Ligand binder design. Structure first.
Ligand SMILES: [Zn+2]
Length: 889
């Protein structure tokens, strides 16, 4: 396997000025003809002309309209096409080729492939080489003239980049359309779509130039009634970029297309965004609440690529976080503004500190700008995306809105029409940093370590208050554990948004303050502090770090009740849970190790339980925030604090803590579940797809959370509420009734009931599979066998496979069964999936990422399965590289 290194970048010895494409789609084959108007660059040294071309069947290749001969003039090994330099011209020449590809049998969903009855392309990152020969790297900018022909009955809608400049009939029931896209673009932003698409349409008028923009959202005819919310989110996205960043859409038309078979959430192209159907289609009747925030984020995300991608593209794929981290950052600002709920930011932190922190402490650890790769498809990670977003968000925290918007404008103006790197963005932010501090000697050179240094920093605190002096001191210390990427970790530029809370009245004591920690340790002193405060640290989660607040549970409860910042209250509650979890874990662990006939467990803090009741009973507190405080931290967040985790002991720990709190608050849980029904399940706007109330959906989340707690506790006659819940029109409700019925004899009755409600909608049935998959059933393995034989079958749809297996992998007690049956199960699924889709096979390895953090017996079980999968003779490069790095080989 060839390893690409970031330090080895050098420009190409060739230039591609113009691409002229003819894509002829037939029933059993697709013929691709391409003429490349090329030239010799100033970096040429007379080397061989080597194109990328994977899986192409050559009919002929030429240079200046003279056919080349295989063996003597060129070689092709199904991966690289090598034209020997003695046959390569020294001036402007034309390279042409005709290849045959087969999207009908392209089940890897990369390049050009068929999804149901729609043919679409996925060229990010190295997918264009699967369509035709090219120097498939982002710094090769070219102009595109693309013609597409197909059977008119099967593919009446033809879409590609640029303007549709010609439509013509073809003998034999065929037709063609030609698209010219004059602006230079990299090949990964090439896109083509063909199918019997139906659409919703709207006209958007830009803010400053008053230009009319046509908006189109496409799907198959069956699901055309699920396009309305996506259209609304597109309008919201365009208005937000205009209002926040002052950026207008550059083109006259924008297309969104939903496809059923897709490896990820979506992929941007210039003017034509292609989506996984589950991230674009929704209706109140056929979608759970989660889809509405998901479509909003994903539609906004792909739109926020348009302006920046139209001017500043990536120089190489090591800069992936420059376009991905920044776009997720803009995506999160957008959703925070649109939802107007504190749980939007909380949900982003919750995923980062669980999924991303696990990855950053695993053998897969990498910085947001890696130093090397052999398969680019394996570095579209939560580190590059979500930690990258947090690093881009810290620029805004450090600079504030005004100077951040200025640094953003500098970045575009300085690099417009060219490729850029992470250093280019840091330079533009540095120029804004010098302007804010009013000191042209200031710099952000230390900030570059956020791009180069792996691992999660640890930030610890000590305090001192001199009552006589009214002087308060915060001693801060930072540290990053050494790993395989750096033996010596350097201190980072860590912004710490802090407040000081008066414990006597809950009032703020200082104005907005962001501490700038740039050393291994520092002491920040505050004068005129009238009383000893309680510190509110890392407000808004101002840095991607482990926070060790060193506060007592009494101080954390006071923050939980009275602090102004949603994250610090959420983090204080998290800290109290973790202290309880680690204590009860060790007590169960030593009782199991010493084989005790009797032992003691430390109760949950009674004042902590009283505080939760205080907040739950507050009518003016946020329902989404309430659902967070009644839920223990994620398992994947807990495992970052326990060595040799025994999953059975952790399950017993969570079980004890939940029942301790339920033993006191279940009457309050039931009262809230009943009082919340009116507003949470209000049907006033059930048939208005464009009316979305994120506050209302958070009420449903709280009801579904409390109903789960009450069902686990076997609350008296709670089955009556479960049966009634089954009849709610909201899929979030009646799918919850299925999962909570797992603790009752009526489970399979609701199983069949909800299946009948889900089977006729493709996306809804996938949500039903997820609900069954995550059901806390003792017979879950037999239920999974029923899903395979009766529903899933031999489906190659990644949404089907992921829905059946991934939620089951989070069942702490059953997936981690000590026999290893759960590991053998997923291992068989990955190997089966790797035969037709390596990218989805790698995604299904997610449960193995924590393998070296479990008890010794489970480490052995997981490692044995991973070594079994590595010995498969037909293993893909993607899966092999992933498992090699994960097992430290
Ligand atoms: Zn993106």
């Amino acid at each position: 396997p060839k390893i690409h290194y970031r330090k080895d970048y050098k420009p190409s010895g060739f230039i591609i000025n113009q691409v002229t494409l003819n894509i002829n789609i037939h029933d059993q084959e697709t013929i691709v003809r391409s003429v490349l108007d090329m030239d010799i660059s100033k970096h040429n040294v007379g080397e061989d002309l080597v194109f990328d071309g994977v899986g192409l069947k050559i009919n002929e290749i030429s240079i200046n309209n003279k056919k080349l001969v295989e063996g003597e003039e060129y070689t092709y090994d199904n991966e690289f096409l090598t034209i020997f330099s003695k046959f390569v011209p020294k001036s402007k020449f034309a390279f042409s080729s005709e290849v045959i590809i087969h999207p009908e049998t392209n089940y890897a969903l990369t390049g050009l492939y068929k999804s149901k009855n729609i043919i679409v392309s996925q060229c990010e990152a190295t997918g264009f080489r699967r369509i035709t020969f090219f120097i498939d790297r982002p710094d090769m900018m070219a102009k595109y003239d693309v013609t597409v022909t197909a059977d008119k009955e099967k593919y009446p809608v033809l879409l590609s980049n640029g303007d549709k400049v010609n439509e013509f009939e073809i003998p034999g029931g065929r037709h063609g359309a030609r698209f010219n896209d004059p602006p230079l673009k990299p090949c990964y932003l090439f896109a083509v779509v063909a199918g019997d698409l139906k659409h919703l349409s709207a006209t958007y008028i830009t803010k400053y130039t008053k230009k009319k923009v046509e908006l189109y959202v496409f799907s198959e005819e069956k699901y055309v009634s699920k396009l309305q919310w996506a259209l609304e989110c597109l309008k919201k996205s365009m208005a937000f970029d205009e209002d926040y960043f002052g950026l207008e859409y550059d083109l006259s038309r924008l297309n969104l297309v939903a496809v059923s078979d897709f490896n990820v959430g979506a992929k941007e192209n210039k003017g034509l965004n292609i989506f996984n159907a589950n991230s674009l289609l929704a209706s109140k009747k056929n979608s759970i609440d989660f889809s509405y925030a998901r479509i909003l984020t994903v539609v906004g995300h792909e739109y926020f690529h348009q302006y920046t991608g139209n001017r500043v593209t990536l120089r190489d794929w090591f800069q992936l976080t420059l376009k991905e981290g920044l776009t997720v950052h803009r995506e999160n600002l957008f959703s925070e503004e649109m939802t107007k709920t504190v749980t939007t930011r909380l949900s982003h932190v919750d995923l980062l500190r669980s999924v991303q922190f696990l990855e950053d402490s695993s053998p897969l650890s990498h910085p947001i700008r890696p130093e090397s790769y052999v398969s680019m498809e394996n570095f579209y990670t939560t580190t590059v995306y979500d930690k990258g977003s947090e690093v881009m968000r810290m620029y805004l925290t450090i600079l504030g809105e005004e100077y951040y918007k200025k640094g953003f404008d500098i970045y575009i103006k300085k690099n417009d029409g060219n490729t850029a790197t992470c250093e280019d963005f840091n330079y533009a932010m540095e120029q804004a940093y010098k302007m804010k501090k009013a000191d042209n000697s200031a710099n952000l050179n230390q900030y570059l370590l956020w791009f180069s240094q792996s691992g999660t920093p640890h930030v610890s605190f000590k305090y001192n208050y001199d009552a006589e002096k009214k002087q308060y001191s915060i001693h801060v210390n930072q540290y990053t554990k050494p790993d395989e990427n750096q033996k010596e970790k350097k201190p980072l530029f860590i912004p710490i948004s802090v407040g000081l809370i008066n414990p006597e009245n809950g009032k703020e004591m200082i104005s907005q303050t962001t501490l700038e920690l740039t050393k291994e340790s520092d002491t920040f002193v505050f004068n005129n502090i009238a009383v000893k405060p309680i510190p509110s640290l890392f407000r808004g989660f101002s840095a991607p770090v482990y926070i060790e607040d060193q506060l007592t549970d009494e101080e954390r409860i006071l923050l939980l009740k009275y602090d102004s910042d949603a994250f610090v209250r959420y983090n204080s509650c998290t800290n109290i849970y973790m202290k309880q979890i680690l204590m009860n874990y060790n007590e169960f662990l030593k009782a199991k190790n010493e084989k005790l006939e009797s032992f003691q467990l430390t109760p949950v803090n009674a004042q902590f339980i009283d505080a939760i009741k205080y907040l739950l009973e507050d009518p003016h507190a946020d329902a989404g925030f309430k659902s967070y405080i009644v839920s223990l931290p994620q398992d994947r967040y807990i495992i970052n604090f326990v060595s040799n985790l025994d999953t059975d002991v952790l399950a017993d720990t969570k079980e004890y803590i939940y029942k301790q709190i339920g033993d006191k608050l279940n009457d309050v849980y039931y009262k809230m579940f009943k009082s919340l029904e009116a507003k949470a399940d209000d049907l006033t706007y059930f048939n208005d797809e464009s009316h979305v109330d994120f506050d209302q959906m958070n009420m449903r989340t709280l009801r579904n959370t409390l109903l789960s707690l009450l069902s686990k506790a076997q609350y008296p006659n709670i089955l009556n509420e479960i049966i009634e819940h089954s009849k709610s029109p909201y899929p979030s409700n009646w799918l919850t009734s299925l999962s909570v019925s797992a603790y009752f004899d009526k489970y399979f009755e609701l199983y069949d009931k909800t299946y009948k409600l889900s089977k006729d909608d493709e996306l809804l049935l996938q949500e039903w599979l997820k609900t069954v998959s995550r059901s806390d059933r003792k017979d879950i393995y037999e239920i999974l066998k029923k899903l395979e034989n009766e529903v899933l079958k031999d489906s190659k749809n990644p949404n089907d496979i992921r829905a059946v297996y991934l939620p089951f992998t989070n069942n702490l007690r059953r997936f981690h069964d000590i026999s290893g049956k759960g590991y053998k199960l997923i291992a068989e699924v990955i190997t089966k999936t790797d035969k037709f889709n390596p990218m989805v096979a790698t995604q299904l390895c997610e449960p193995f990422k924590l393998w070296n953090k479990l008890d010794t017996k489970r480490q052995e079980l997981m490692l044995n399965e991973m070594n079994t999968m590595l010995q498969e003779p037909q293993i893909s490069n993607n899966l092999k590289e992933y498992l090699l790095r994960l097992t430290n080989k």
